[PDB]
Every structure is written in C-alpha cells, then in structure tokens.
Amino acid sequence: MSAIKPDMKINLRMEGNVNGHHFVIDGDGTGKPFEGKQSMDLEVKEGGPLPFAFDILTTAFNRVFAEYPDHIQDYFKQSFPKGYSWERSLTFEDGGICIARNDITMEGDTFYNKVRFHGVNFPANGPVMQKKTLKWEPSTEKMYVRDGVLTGDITMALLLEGNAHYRCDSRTTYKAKEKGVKLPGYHLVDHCIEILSHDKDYNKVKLYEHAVAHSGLPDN
Amino acid sequence: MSAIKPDMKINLRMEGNVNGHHFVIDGDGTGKPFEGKQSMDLEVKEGGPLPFAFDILTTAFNRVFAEYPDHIQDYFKQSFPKGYSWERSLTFEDGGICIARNDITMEGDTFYNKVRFHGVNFPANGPVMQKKTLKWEPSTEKMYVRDGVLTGDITMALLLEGNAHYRCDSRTTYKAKEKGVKLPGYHLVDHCIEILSHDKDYNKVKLYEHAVAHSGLPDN
Amino acid sequence: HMSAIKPDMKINLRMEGNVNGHHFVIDGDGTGKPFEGKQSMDLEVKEGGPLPFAFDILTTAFNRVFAEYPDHIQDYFKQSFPKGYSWERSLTFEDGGICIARNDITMEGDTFYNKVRFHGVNFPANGPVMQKKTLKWEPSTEKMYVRDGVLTGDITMALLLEGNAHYRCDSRTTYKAKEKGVKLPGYHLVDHCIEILSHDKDYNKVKLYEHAVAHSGLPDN
Amino acid sequence: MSAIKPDMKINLRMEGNVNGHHFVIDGDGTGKPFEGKQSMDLEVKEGGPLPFAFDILTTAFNRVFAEYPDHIQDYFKQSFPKGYSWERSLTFEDGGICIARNDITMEGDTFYNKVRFHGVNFPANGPVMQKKTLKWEPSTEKMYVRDGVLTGDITMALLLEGNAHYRCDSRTTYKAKEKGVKLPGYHLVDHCIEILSHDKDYNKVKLYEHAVAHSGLPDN
Ligand SMILES: O=S([O-])[O-]
Ligand SMILES: O=S([O-])[O-]
Ligand SMILES: O=S([O-])[O-]
Ligand SMILES: O=S([O-])[O-]
Numbered sequence: 001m002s003a004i005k006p007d008m009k010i011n012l013r014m015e016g017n018v019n020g021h022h023f024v025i026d027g028d029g030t031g032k033p034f035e036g037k038q039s040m041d042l043e044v045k046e047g048g049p050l051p052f053a054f055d056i057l058t059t060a061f062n063r064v065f066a067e068y069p070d071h072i073q074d075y076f077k078q079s080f081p082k083g084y085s086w087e088r089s090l091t092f093e094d095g096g097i098c099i100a101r102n103d104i105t106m107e108g109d110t111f112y113n114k115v116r117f118h119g120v121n122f123p124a125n126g127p128v129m130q131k132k133t134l135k136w137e138p139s140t141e142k143m144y145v146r147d148g149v150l151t152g153d154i155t156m157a158l159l160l161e162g163n164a165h166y167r168c169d170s171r172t173t174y175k176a177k178e179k180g181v182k183l184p185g186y187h188l189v190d191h192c193i194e195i196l197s198h199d200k201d202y203n204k205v206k207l208y209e210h211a212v213a214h215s216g217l218p219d220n
Numbered sequence: 221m222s223a224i225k226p227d228m229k230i231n232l233r234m235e236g237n238v239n240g241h242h243f244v245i246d247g248d249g250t251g252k253p254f255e256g257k258q259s260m261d262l263e264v265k266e267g268g269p270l271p272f273a274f275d276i277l278t279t280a281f282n283r284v285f286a287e288y289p290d291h292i293q294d295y296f297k298q299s300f301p302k303g304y305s306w307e308r309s310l311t312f313e314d315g316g317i318c319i320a321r322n323d324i325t326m327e328g329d330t331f332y333n334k335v336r337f338h339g340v341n342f343p344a345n346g347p348v349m350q351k352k353t354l355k356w357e358p359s360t361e362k363m364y365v366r367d368g369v370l371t372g373d374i375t376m377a378l379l380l381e382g383n384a385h386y387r388c389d390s391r392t393t394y395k396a397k398e399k400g401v402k403l404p405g406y407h408l409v410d411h412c413i414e415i416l417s418h419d420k421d422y423n424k425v426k427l428y429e430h431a432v433a434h435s436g437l438p439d440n
Numbered sequence: 441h442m443s444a445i446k447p448d449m450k451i452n453l454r455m456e457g458n459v460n461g462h463h464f465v466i467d468g469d470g471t472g473k474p475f476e477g478k479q480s481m482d483l484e485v486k487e488g489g490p491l492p493f494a495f496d497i498l499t500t501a502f503n504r505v506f507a508e509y510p511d512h513i514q515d516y517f518k519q520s521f522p523k524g525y526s527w528e529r530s531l532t533f534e535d536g537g538i539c540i541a542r543n544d545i546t547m548e549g550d551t552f553y554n555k556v557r558f559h560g561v562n563f564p565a566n567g568p569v570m571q572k573k574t575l576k577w578e579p580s581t582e583k584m585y586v587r588d589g590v591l592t593g594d595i596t597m598a599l600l601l602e603g604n605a606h607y608r609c610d611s612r613t614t615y616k617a618k619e620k621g622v623k624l625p626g627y628h629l630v631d632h633c634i635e636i637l638s639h640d641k642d643y644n645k646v647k648l649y650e651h652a653v654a655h656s657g658l659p660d661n
Numbered sequence: 662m663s664a665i666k667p668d669m670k671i672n673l674r675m676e677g678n679v680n681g682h683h684f685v686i687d688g689d690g691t692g693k694p695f696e697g698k699q700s701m702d703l704e705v706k707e708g709g710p711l712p713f714a715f716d717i718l719t720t721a722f723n724r725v726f727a728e729y730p731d732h733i734q735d736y737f738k739q740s741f742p743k744g745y746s747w748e749r750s751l752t753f754e755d756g757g758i759c760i761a762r763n764d765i766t767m768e769g770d771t772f773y774n775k776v777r778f779h780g781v782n783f784p785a786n787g788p789v790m791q792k793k794t795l796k797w798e799p800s801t802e803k804m805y806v807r808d809g810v811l812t813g814d815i816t817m818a819l820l821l822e823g824n825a826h827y828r829c830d831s832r833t834t835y836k837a838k839e840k841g842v843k844l845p846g847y848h849l850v851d852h853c854i855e856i857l858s859h860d861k862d863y864n865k866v867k868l869y870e871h872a873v874a875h876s877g878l879p880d881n
Contacts, residue, residue, distance in 0.1 A: 017336070020305060020321065085240065087340035089317040095366075095391060097309040099319055099340045101240065116237070118338050120307035120319045121393050123367040137847050138877025140801035142816045144826045146315075147343040153828065155803050155814045157847065165805045165847065167814065169830075171315060173341050186798050186818065186826065192878035210878045216799025217853040217871050357627045358657025360581035362596050364606045373596045373608065375583045377627065385585045385627065387594065389610075406578050406598065406606065412658035430658045436579025437633035437651045458777070461746060461762065526681065528781035530758040536807075536832060538750040540760055540781045542681065557678070559779050561748035561760045562834050564808035587756075588784035612756060614782050 003080040004033050004064065009110040010040055012061060016117035018098075019129065023047025027061055027113070029207075033077065036067035036211040039196070042204070049201035052122065055133040055158055056090070058193055058207060060100045060117050063152075063174065066189055066211035073184035074213075075150055079176040081106050086174045093167040096122035127160050134159040138192040141170075143213075145183050150174040152189070188220075189213045223301045224253050224284065229330040230260055232281060236337030238318070239349065243267030247281055247333070249427075253297065256287035256431040259416070262424070269421030272342065273353040275378055278413055278427055280308070280320040280337050283372075283394065286409055286431035293404035294433075295370050299396040300326050306394045310376075313387040316342040347378065347386050354379040358412040361390075363433075365403050370394040372409070408440070409433045444522040445474050445505065450551040451481055453502060457558030459539070460570065464488030468502055468554070470648075474518065477508035477652040480637070483645070490642035493563065494574040496599055497531070499634055499648055501541045501558050504593075504615065507630050507652035514625035515654075516591050516615065521547050523619040534608040537563040568601050575600040582611075582630040584654075591615045591624060595632075629661075630654045664741035665694050665725070670771040671701055673722060677778030679759070680790065684708030688722055688774070690868075694738065697728035697873050700857070703866040710862035713783065714794040716819055719854055719868055721749070721761040721778050724813075724835065727850055727872035734845035735874070736811055740837040741767050747835045751817075754828040757783040788827050794819045798826070799853040802833075804874075806844050811835040813850070849881075850874045 012027030024046035031038025040061060044050060063086075068074035076084065083105040090098035098119040105112045122128045137159055141152045154170040190212045198205040214220040232247030244266035251258030260281060264270065283306075288294035296304065303325040310318040318339040325332045342348045357379055361372045374390040410432045418425040434440040453468030465487035472479025481502055485491065504527075509515035517525065524546040531539040539560040546553045563569045578600055582593040595611040630652055637647040655661040673688035685707035692699025701722055705711060724747075729735035737745065744766040751759040759780040766773045783789045798820055802813040815831040850872055857867040875881040 017321075020307065020323075087240070089315075089340055091311075091317075095309075097311075097317065097319060097391075099317055099338050101237075101340065103240075116338075118319050118336075120309055120321065121391055124369065125367050137803070137805075138849070139803070140849065140877070142798070142800070142818060144798075144818055146826065147345050149344065153816045155816045155830075157803060157805055159847070165807065169816075171317075171341055185824075186820065188799065188801065190878045190881065212878060216801070217851045217873060220851070357583070357585075358629065358661075359583070360629065360631075360657070362578070362580070362598060364578075364598055366606065375581075375594045375596045375610075377583060377585060377594075379627065383586070383626070385587065389596075406600070408579065408581065410658045410661070432658060436581070437631045437653065440579075440631065458762070461748065461764075528680070530756075530782055532752075532758075536750075538752075538758065538760060538832075540758060540779050542678075542781065544681075557779075559760050559777075561762065562750055562832055565810065566808050588786055590784070612782060 003106060004077050005109055006032060006034055008033055010038065010113070011110055012040065012113035012115060014060060014115035014117055018052050018119035019122055021047060021051050023050060031065045033064050034067065036065055038065040039206065039208045041206050044203040048203045051129065053128045053131045053133040054195070054198070054202040054205060055136060056098065056119065056128055057117060058136065058195065059170065060102065060115055061207055062102070062104055062111060062113065063189065063211070064111065065209065066213050068213045072187045072213055072215065073182060075174065075176065075181060075184050078181050079178065082178040084174060084176045086172050088170060088172040091169045092128070094123055094126050096126065096128055127158070127166050132161045133166065134161060135195070136193050138190065141189040141191060143184065143189060144186045150183055187213055188216050222297045224297055225329050226252060226254055228253055230258060230333070231330055232260065232333040232335060234280065234335035234337055238272050238339035239342050241267060241271055243270060251285045253284050254287065256285055257429070258285040259426065259428045261426050264423040268423040271349065273348045273351045274415070274418070274422040274425060275353040275356060276318065276339065276348055277337060278356065278415065279390065280322065280335050281427055282322070282324055282331060282333060283409065283431070284331065285429060286433050288433045292407050292433055292435065293402055295394065295396065295401065295404050298401055299398070302398040304394060304396045306392050308390060308392040311389045314343055314346045316346065316348055347380050352381045353386065354381065355415065356413050358410065361409040361411060363404065363409060364406045370403055407433055408436050443518045444547065445518055446550055447473060447475055449474055451479060451554070452551050453481065453554035453556060455501065455556040455558055459493050459560035460563050462488060462492055464491060472506050474505050475508065477506055478650070479506040480647065480649045482647055485644040489644040492570065494569045494572045495636070495639070495643040495646060496574040496577060497539065497560065497569055498558060499577065499636065500611070501543065501556055502648055503543070503545055503552060503554065504630065504652070505552065506650060507654050509654045513628050513654050513656065514623050516617065516622060516625050519622050520617040520619065525615060525617045527613050527615045529611060529613040532610045535564055535567045537567065537569055568599070568607050573602045574607065575602060576636065577634050579631065579633040582632060584625065584630060585627045586624050593630070628654055629657050664767065665738050666770050667693060667695060669694060671699065671774065672771055673701065673774035673776060675721060675776035675778055679713050679780035680783050682708060682712055684711060692726045694725050695728065697726050698871050699726045700867065700869045703868060705864045709864045712790065714789045714792045715856070715863040715866060716794040716797060717751070717759065717780065717789055718778060719797065719856065720831065721763065721776055722868055723765055723772060723774065724850065724872070725772070726870065727874050729874045733848045733874050733876065734843055736835065736837065736842060736845050739842050740839065743838040745835060745837045747833050749831060749833045752830045755784055755787050757787065757789055788821050793822045794827065795822060796820050796856070797854050799851065802850040802852060804845065804850060805847045811844055848874055849877050
C-alpha cells in the first residue's frame, strides 16, 4: 500500500498515424513490475494490415516494468497511484521521425495506457515502409534530469533482413502526475524487447520486454 | 489545366497536441497563388489560451502559394485539381520535436486544408513554453527529390526577446494525389511569414506569407 | 573605419588536412572582387594526391569578405579588416561523415592570406565521398545570426550526385573578428553558388569559383 | 604465442586543436587487456594550461582494454600484433563538435597510440570553455557493422558542477590494419572513465577506464 503489486495487469489503447495511414491498436497483458518483465497481446483494430514495420511501434507499447535496485531512486514506482506520463521522439537515420506519448494510470491491479504515435517522412523504399526489420537489439537507456524533468536518451538499432542495422535515437521525457516526486540521479536502464509471435499481417502480436536499472560499471 | 484562379479562398482546420495540451484552430483566408502571397485569420476553437508560443504552428497554416518562374516545374500547381498532401518534421535545437501534416484539396475557388500538429519534449523553461518568440526570420527552403518524393529542407530560426535566435530544422515531404505528376529539379523557395496582428492570448491571429521560387545564384 | 579592402583583391591560401586518415596539403592562388561577392581560385594538391575522396567536400573551405553586402546590412567581414578574422566550421553529412575546418584570415596590401585546416572522419567506404560520385554543390543560402555572442552561419547544403540523387550536408560556421569593436549584424541571409570551373583528371589541379550576395530575405530582396 | 599479454604498457601522444588552441599531451600507462582495466598518467607538453575542460579529451586517451566474454568476437584483441585505427566524432548538444583519430600499434608488451583531436564551435559561455565539467557518467557503447566497418555509437553525458548534465553523441569507426580480421556481431560495451587525480591546471592528470563487453538483456 505500496500501490504496485508483484503481479499487475496491463490495459493499453494506441491510436496513431504513420505515413498518413491511420490505425488503432489494443493491448492486453500482464507483468511483474519488480522483476522488470512484461508481456502483452496486441490487436490491430483499425488500419490493418499495417503498411509499415510493426517494430517501430513496440517501445510505445512503461518504465514501471523495470527492476530497480535499492541504491537507485525508482521514479516510476514512486509515481503511483496517481501515475505519470511520457513523451518521446524517435529519430531514424533515414529521416523518418516519430513522436509518441503515453498517459499512464492505475486502477487496482491494472495499468491503463493511453498511447498516441505519429510517424512522418519515412522513405517509400526504406526498411520501415518495406517491412524489412527483424527486431530491436538490446539497448541501454541513459536516465538524467534536464530542466526539472527525468529524461531518457537511447541509441537504438533495428536488425534488418540481410543483417544490416537501422539506427534510431530515442529521447523520452517522463513526468509524474503528482507534485513533488523526488527525481533520481543519473542511472542506466537495460532493455530488451521481442515480438514472441505474430500472424502474417501483424494484426496480432505478442510482445515481451525485460528491463533492469543499474549504475553502470563498476557497480553493475 | 490546374483550375487554380488568380485569387483563391483558403479554408483551414488544424487539430494538435503540444506538450500534452490539445487544441483546435480554424483558419479562413484568401491568397494569390501566382503572386505567392496569402493571408489568413486564425481562431483558437479549443485549448485556448495556448500555453506555448503560437509561432511554432505558423508554417503549418501550402506551397501552391509560391511564385514559380517558367523555368522551374511547379509541382504544387500541377497537383491540382486533384490536390496533394505533405508531412513535416520540426527539430528544435533544445530537443523540442514536432510533426505535422496537411491534406490539401480544392473545390471551386477554395483550398481546403486538414492539418494535424504534434509537439513533444519542449523544456519547461525554453522559449517555446515561456513564449519568448517574436517571429520566424525569412528563410529559404531547399527543394530536391529523395526516393521519388519532392522534399524540402529548411534552416529556420525564431527571433527571440533580446534578439537572440532559436533554431529549428524543417523537413517536409510533398506528395501529389494523382500518379505521375512530374517532379521538379533542385530549386529554392524563399519564404517570409508574419503574424500581422493578434489578441493578447493569441486566440485570434492574422497571418501572412510571401513565397517565391528561384534557382539561386547566379540566376535569381 | 576604412577597411583597406580594394575592389580587386588577390587571394593566397594554404590548406592542410586529413580525411579518412589520408593526409593532404593543398595550395591556392586566386583573385576576387569583394564588393561584387565574386572570387576565383586555382588550387593545387601539393601532398597526398591523388585524393581518394570527392574534391567537392573541401570547396567551401577554400571567406565571407567575398559577398556583396547591401548598405542596410552590417558587413562584419569587411569591417574586420585590416586586422582580419577567423572562422571554424563543422560539416555534418547525412551518412555519418563529419568534417571540421578552420581558416585564419589576414590581409597584407592587396592580398588575403588564408591558413586553412580540414579534417573529416567516419565517411563510409561505399558512400559518394569515398567513391567520388559527387557532381557539385547546389546553390545555397546561409542563415547569419548571433549565437552566444558570436556571428554564426547555418546552412542546409546539398551535393548533386551522379544518377541525379542529392547528398545532404549541414554546415555551421562561427565567425570571430580579430579586433575589438566590430559591430554585430542583425539576422540576414547570404546566397551562395560555388563551382569547379575546371579540373584535371585526378583533381590535383582545380579552378574554383564562388558568387555570394547578402540580403534580408523576402519581401524586400 | 599470443600477441595480447595479461599486463601491458601504454605509450601515447596526442596533438590537437580546440577552438583555435593548439596542444600536445603525452601519456604513459599500464593495463590488463583481459580484465578491461587501464590507467594512464598524462602530461600536457604544449598549450598548458588548457583553456577548456580536460574531460572532452579523455575518451580519446583503445577497446583492446575491455573484458570480452567467449560468446562475443573480440575484434580488438584479434587485431594484434599489426594493430588497428579508429576515427571518432563527438557531437555536443550546444554545437561543439570534435573529431579524433588514433592509430594503434604494438611492440612487445607496449601499445603505441598516435592520437589527434580537433574541436570547433564551443561557445565561450558553455561548460567546456568555462571548465564546469566534473566527469563522464558511466556509458554503454552500441557496437554494430555498417558498410563493412565496426561502428560504436554512444549516448554520453558529462556531469556538470551543480549536477546538471551536458550531452554528447559519439560515433567511432574501428578498422583492423590486417586484412581478414573477422567482424563481431552486434554487442554492447559498458565503460566508466575517471580522472583519479590532477594538478590545479590539469597539466598532469591520472586517468582510469574500465570496460566490459556483453550481449545485453537477458544474458547480462
Ligand atoms: O526481454 S527480451 O528477450 O525482448
Ligand atoms: O510574407 S512576410 O512580409 O511576413
Ligand atoms: O557563381 S557560382 O555558379 O560558382
Ligand atoms: O574508470 S571507472 O572506475 O569510473
């Protein structure tokens, strides 16, 4: 009491537009906030089949699901029950640019996610519009405070078919709903994200993430 | 050929969300497509007073309004009567990122503009959230083709209080609705945009743009 | 004060640099008309020739004194003389190539002297620079403004490539007068066009030309 | 008969120019390649006292010093005895940009390093020219292949006095001298780097780095 339980449910609704293509996607899942693990079943409700790589959406589908050790302030679990919100930009190396936001709330044992995602300027023959991506490689998010706001920057990479990589820089700004939530010091958060399964058109996808916060070398 | 008249009316509808603040803005104006001039009266219908600098929105409020000389293919006038659409990213120097789009159609003597605008990651004490902007400086858009699509990049700058400047890079991708509209060669488009007047909170704004296409030195 | 800049000036230039780990030295001798914003220069690779990279990436490094300034815009560059000024520049190419360059500019009599350095890193082996697939810079427009108390010019640039694709490069130059008391200009634009008029097969010898004109943008330009 | 020995020496010379200020700096160190730990004593031979934050130079003062696990190809240890070279760009958030190069060779138990470092466009009032930096935060370098070349991208941050942070993006390209050195798959390398001690003007500096390669979650 102690808002967050060892096992939580996850309800998510994303709406968005990439390349002028509108879509709506519902998510239903479960996770273990204290182990930093979560899974979700996603369903394209409108806009299917998506004309673009589903992978660009997957980080938009909650840093509550991250294992924080005792020596690092856990801004995210501290933000409940009132919750918090985040904004993000994704800057892909070929000019594709996405913005996204999620307003995260909690009712009982369930997190609710209102997610918006917009992508512009993706080249027609790029790996995104040609759906040539395989997965995100595991990443490390750098967490720091800027102008009063917890900020996470990430150098990300999509593995492509033919074993090339496709670079994307992510900046996320995280804001507790409640006044006064103490900001953490600089720290790192390892991520790995995986589409465990999906149908042909990616109208149905099962997503998994694992995340662990740490202080970097040599204290990790 | 185009059915674009020397004098046209402009109907505009924008919806958007900056920093989590949703808004709706209507525009009604008139322009001279062949003189590359237009003006518009904008009214904030929802979300007023805006908590952010109105200037960030104004380039989203149609390159049909640009004087094109004979020796340069005019992709925009050649796109009608069927019309065209664009997507844009605005990358501000302090991490603020916006995306925008506009679907442009024509019915008789009126252009219709369905515009969307999203902005994320603006710092609380930056010139945008603190409304320290004065105007966009006159600019020059660099037009070229990339992956089969007409693309415009601009080095933009907002004049700020005290005559400092706040930099923003714009990339716009332009796509004619009808197939096989001939793409132009590399060229430049000069722009100047100005808020001619506005009320205290910028719920009401009169906007003007002048744009002229040219080939650069030594010609221009 | 009187600039001591004549309508017809000589240009002496010395570049040294390193791109992709390849060292080079290039000399330049040219002439120009500061008030007309036009200049031409004959360049000769003295060391490291033949260059294994596109000569074009070097050409903007080969002096905003050579820009026609109208009377209503403060001319920081001509006012920097006789003492002179220096600039530093970053070039950020869309495929990861990054160059930095500097020029220290002085004047003796009818001649500008230029000590130029140029370093480029992270150009991919099969990109248009290492493969020498560039044709020219397209005409550009430099945005001039005071940033952190220093006149700065930002530019969206584009190299035409063979196959008529374009290759994007963003430029930022910082310009600093050597002498105190040089008035800073308000925001303005400088149109450029730069052209290799001729070259020998390996670009060991190159004739370069530039035309530049400052203006206030629309609606009065 | 291995080229890499458990305890090795490091001889280094850097020459460079930041904001027009020329400098020469010699380094003499020792390290343990297999444990990814090294220390070096640096001495400014020319250009002291440096007018800029010594911290911008420290990553330029060899990925052979990284603990590589068996399941990740170790490109750097495989590059000896002949050696390898790297080029780097450092893009700071306020427009300061640096490039650096190191040509690394080996004789007996000693690595030799020919290092060059050039920085431009640092603002006079910024934390580099004001010497307001305290340290690099621990980081994670993302290693991947692009156009045949091992490439490392890093989201870096300098902690500043007052506990603000100053962001810098690093790209390094690494090239074995010898033909036929096998490229590794995608992986991460954790770093931490620390000035253990220095005299008042940073004419003398003792530097330490620890680095460890890993596969990220869930392995790590
Ligand atoms: O937790 S990872 O295997 O997507
Ligand atoms: O089109 S300009 O005169 O604001
Ligand atoms: O005057 S320009 O075509 O070098
Ligand atoms: O080199 S590490 O101990 O910050």
